Structure 1
Amino acid sequence: QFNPYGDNGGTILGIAGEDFAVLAGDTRNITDYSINSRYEPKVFDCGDNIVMSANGFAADGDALVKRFKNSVKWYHFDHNDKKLSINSAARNIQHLLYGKRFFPYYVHTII
């Protein structure tokens, strides 16, 4: 039977300072006991000073990031180029994820 999920490995981590934040992730991409790539980035600049990574099943990760980047783009179009605050991004991403509650994106997301 077709399994619509896979596992691409890797790992990520975020730390926040007083006036900065970092989002780190390795660049290895795997399936089973093989390496697909030693350099495939999985942490992204999304605009408005928001960095994002969705790590686990990479096809799901990429779809989410793509949808969120596109969300930022339409936020600008719809609310007079207003900056998307990080708290607002967070809530937006909850709705992106929960919209697939019964067929989930297999990712741990950090922004």
Structure 2
Amino acid sequence: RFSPYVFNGGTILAIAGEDFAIVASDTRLSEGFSIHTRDSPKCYKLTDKTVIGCSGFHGDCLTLTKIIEARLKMYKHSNNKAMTTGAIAAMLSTILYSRRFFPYYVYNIIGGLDEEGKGAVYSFDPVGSYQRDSFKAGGSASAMLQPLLDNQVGFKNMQNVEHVPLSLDRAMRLVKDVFISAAERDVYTGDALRICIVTKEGIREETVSLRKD
């Protein structure tokens, strides 16, 4: 009979930096065997210091996005200040749990700064549990993406591996290489790569073309 869920693809990625955070995603909205559009970014500037990514069911991504955008203004009108990143994660965990018996089909990763100018990544299940991590990939090709960042970022399984902190440019060429490497194998990887960068100054955006199978 009538099914209420469908899968829209998409794959997001966040990396916490030392004084920055990088959130990126492709821009393909599509389902079945066909393409709806080649332009659908998953970057969402919540504040100047908080960017969320939303993959999964697209209508739930839109609805959840707008509900968050309401509750920020409810907080600010309640308290004469802006939310912090952990406050946003602590709220949205309750929001996701609030429909426990009819869940959103949504994966979510929040990137952004702390109160001290440090990167913070919060990855969500589709129910409402979370933790703070250094780097998480979410979406279809997250299984393609995670161990490469475990090797390069996490320095795992390497002998005599020194530990330089990740520079911003090394992170940029890391992202730009790894989405090409995912694009060569996943069918859901899009054609353009919206990259959003949160610094102490503000939000930078950048779009890099991909292949278009």
TM over 0.5: yes
- Cα RMSD for the two superposed structures: 0.9
Look up the match of 2:50.
Answer: 50
1-structure distance, mates of 2:54, 2:29: 13
Deviation at 1:83, TM superposition (A): 2.0
Q: CA deviation at 1:48?
A: 4.6
Q: Aligned AA for 1:14?
A: A
Higher gyration radius (CA): 2
Mark the runs of 5 or more structure 1 residues left unpaired by the alignment.
Answer: none
8 Å CA contact 1:48–1:84 kept in 2: the answer is: no
- Secondary structure at the counterpart of residue 40 of structure 2: coil
| Structure 1 residue 45: Cα displacement | 0.4
Structure with the higher strand share, 1 or 2: 2
Identity across the alignment (%): 44
| Aligned residue number for residue 7 of structure 1 | 7
Aligned mates of 1:86, 1:75 — CA distance in 2: 13
Give the 4+ runs in structure 1 shifted more than 3 A: none
TM-score, length-normalised on structure 1?
0.95
Report what 2:173 is aligned to. Answer: none
SS at match of 1:71: helix
Whose relative contact order is higher, 1 or 2, with alpha carbons under 8 Å and at least 6 apart?
2
Q: Deviation string for 1:32-72 (max 9, x for gaps)?
A: 11111100112200125210112001111111111111111
Instruction: Give 2:106's aligned residue.
Output: 107
Asked whether the equivalents of residues 7 and 31 of structure 1 are also in contact (C-alpha less than 8 Å), the reply is yes
Q: Which amino acid aligns with 2:89?
A: A
Q: Distance in 2 between matches of 1:87 and 1:69?
A: 16
